[PDB]
Amino acid sequence: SLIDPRAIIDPSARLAADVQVGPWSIVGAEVEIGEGTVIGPHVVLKGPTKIGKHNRIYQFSSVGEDTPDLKYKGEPTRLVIGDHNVIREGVTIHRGTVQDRAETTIGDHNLIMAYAHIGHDSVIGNHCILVNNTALAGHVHVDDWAILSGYTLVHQYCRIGAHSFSGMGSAIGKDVPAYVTVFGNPAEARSMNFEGMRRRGFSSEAIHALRRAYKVVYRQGHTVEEALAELAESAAQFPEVAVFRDSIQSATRGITR
């Protein structure tokens, strides 16, 4: 451990073994930091916030702030961050709202690049990448391995499916199904993230069942109900297709087309 004496550590904060806190950082009341986490210089941490192990948080980041969206803040709302996350320069992460989840949740092994915004009540899974200035407005669910390219904007309540991909400057207003590639403002479905399936070792059979799964949903004039029925068999054979099918079935307010 090195706790720099120019940092401010609230008496109610809890620091585990091997935690580093750089100069002029604030570890506010009710912030818990897990084993081996490195807080850079000029970082503002605010609670109630739970941060796990072996995280890295860069300078000028505001982690666990209140949403500005309310004037009168509800407390106590939480921020939970898991393990092995990188949070780059100037990132903003807001805690939840009493109305909704009362918690913003980030899992493990995520890369959140400079000036990205994680809005109130959002949930990030594991192994996600949010590129520079990605902004999640609030109540955004990002499932595992999803990649949002630089300056991707996401409206409230949108679901970003597992292994999905957004192009630079995408503006997402509807759910993105698992594996789907989206581009533009407003965002449009283009293809699937075949590159990602390969890099995570999907069988060719799985990749071909997912290609056919795309066409079923987007290209053959079927209701969502008819697509779910058509996808049932492929979904039962391939867990990878089931992830796709589940992402479409969970979309009650429709999907990015």
Add this chain to the structure above:
Amino acid sequence: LIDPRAIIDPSARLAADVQVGPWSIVGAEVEIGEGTVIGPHVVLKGPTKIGKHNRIYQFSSVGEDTPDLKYKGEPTRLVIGDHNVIREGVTIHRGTVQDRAETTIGDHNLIMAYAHIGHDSVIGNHCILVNNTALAGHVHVDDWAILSGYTLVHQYCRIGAHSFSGMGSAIGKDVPAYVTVFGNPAEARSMNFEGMRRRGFSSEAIHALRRAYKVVYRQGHTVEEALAELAESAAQFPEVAVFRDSIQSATRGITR
């Protein structure tokens, strides 16, 4: 109240109950008013006036020089009213001598993280600038206007009262009062009926304003023709006069 690790210039001026966080700079000729909380890690530069019950969050640079090459160090101003919330990393520049030598913000404005307010810009009251909104300079934002995340505005554009931009809009012409605009480049879509409900507009003044939108946008009229038919509706409803006056004062083109 003033944290001892903050830097207060001799020539600054702070009201009784002003709070200033650690590692913040209150530079030369900065006035701060009653009940204003300056966060930690804030750079204020002057000549700048800040009113009362304002909150400025960490990493904000309020009152710097414009990098606009037309600026050359003249002692231009920035003025900020009361009950404003300025969030993480906001940049606000002072005026230029070429145009009035003042940047102006009124009252009850919510300016979210990394928003930029360029030289000589004039913001009214009860405005929302969502994350990373950017006003290049000489942008006039009238009362109750809402600019959604990453809204970009070119110099000299007028954003009308009760107007709304969608996420990632790029505005290059005046937005009339109450008009909703979307995309890059921004195009007119509808009227902020929502925002009229929010101000307790009579259902008559709301029907008057729906008619007004159809006169301007949906009936192949010119602006001169559209301004002409509105004249009586604007005499009848002050709410319609607001809309009519925003179009009248828009001799660079309105957003279509």
Add this chain to the structure above:
Amino acid sequence: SLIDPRAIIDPSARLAADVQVGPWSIVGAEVEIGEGTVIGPHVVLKGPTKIGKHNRIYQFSSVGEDTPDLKYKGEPTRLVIGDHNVIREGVTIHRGTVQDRAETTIGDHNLIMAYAHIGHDSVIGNHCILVNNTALAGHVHVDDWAILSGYTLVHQYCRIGAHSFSGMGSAIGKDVPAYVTVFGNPAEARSMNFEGMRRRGFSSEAIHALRRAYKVVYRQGHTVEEALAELAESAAQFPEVAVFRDSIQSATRGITR
């Protein structure tokens, strides 16, 4: 003195005797700063980094950090900045990767406005303007006098030609030839920077030949090869047309059309 006592200066740092450094700034290990350079408060400089003379770096800037690019594995890579550059509030500049030439390079007289990003292995020439929140992903070459308007996004390996211009919110995925004006997401070729050419004092004859050069590349159904061959003659007569022609010849991502 000119080094604020609240600044951190690494023992291995090399500062010219007149260098100014504001409070709570960090001048890291293996950072060199040349004559006349003013470092504002709250600035983080990481090395190995060379900064030249009469530069100005504003608050909340992170100059010389490691790229988050997963391909980078902590190797000793560098950042070189020249003279008379203005770096505004919250600018991020990353050092290089060994996969290229292990250097990020900025020339002279550049204006880099607030929250602009310069990614690993990028090369900026002289007299360039990067307006607020302009982002260069990596391996981006911006040649002399190019202007990138606010929130211009550039993909890796894209080349931005001399005296080129991008409109507000441009998303560039292909090379911008010298003198060309681009707008939109995705970016679209919309004429040449005649305003900028006229201002900088380009001759009438050079402009007229560039107008014709534009027609050959964009407006005659020619493929890049046909166009290069058809340009050969004017490229041999007018240096500006040679700069234009070379920028098409050197394009590795194709050209913005």
